[PDB]
Design a protein around this ligand. Sequence first.
Ligand SMILES: COc1ccc(CN(CCN(C)C)c2ccccn2)cc1
Length: 270
Amino acid sequence: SPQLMPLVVVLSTICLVTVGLNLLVLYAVRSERKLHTVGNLYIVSLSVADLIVGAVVMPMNILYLLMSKWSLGRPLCLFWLSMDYVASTASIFSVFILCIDRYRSVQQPLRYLKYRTKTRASATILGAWFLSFLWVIPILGWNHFMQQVRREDKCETDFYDVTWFKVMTAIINFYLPTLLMLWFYAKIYKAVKRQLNRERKAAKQLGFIMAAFILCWIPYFIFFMVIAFCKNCCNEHLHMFTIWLGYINSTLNPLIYPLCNENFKKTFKR
Ligand SMILES: COc1ccc(CN(CCN(C)C)c2ccccn2)cc1
């Protein structure tokens, strides 16, 4: 309808800045070579997840919004769902891994003075991405293992019509990472407040990532929490607004990176 165009054309700019800035960060870590550290490898994983979610989901979601009917074939809708889930889980597991390694490095090292090097970073990143693909394994094939889309148009997840699995997977994937990683961040806060500025800059960039991936995702997951128990509580506009708040998180992370530490500003200016 010729009244929703003003919102769609704005989303194109969001997509363009999302893909560009993550690619700019990957340019920074590849064309400067003064940032090949394990923590910067974790932020590279986070930026790769954000670049994937941008370059894949943003055009597909924009097309879905500007044309309220999916006729791009069933396999491609499943591919979009799988890549969206991969990117989102890879992001909130790369941030989880970064927080875990920060905590185990500021753990008053008494057991872990060993390698904090390419070995551990590679192992943990590959583990997180394999867990994301493990999530993808059942979503693509739903009827194959469990005998549970039945909709020619308006393609969505296969498990949209089941409440218990959706609630359980949302609770796990958000609450367990957010609670465990908040506990790790509070332990980091206490340990750093026991030593003590560069640590303050790192802690504040982690805190800004915290603010973005909490206050940008809470509306979406509270919408999942409320939607299952009452189908009268559904609002299409607010659902898309929450999903785009999550994508605003994904595009804010590349703005969190250079606004905190002075190393990225010089690497970006050139
Ligand atoms: C950063 O944290 C995350 C992690 C995963 C996701 C993927 N999504 C929905 C994603 N939407 C955009 C379609 C779900 C759906 C059900 C239960 C859990 N996550 C979102 C946010």
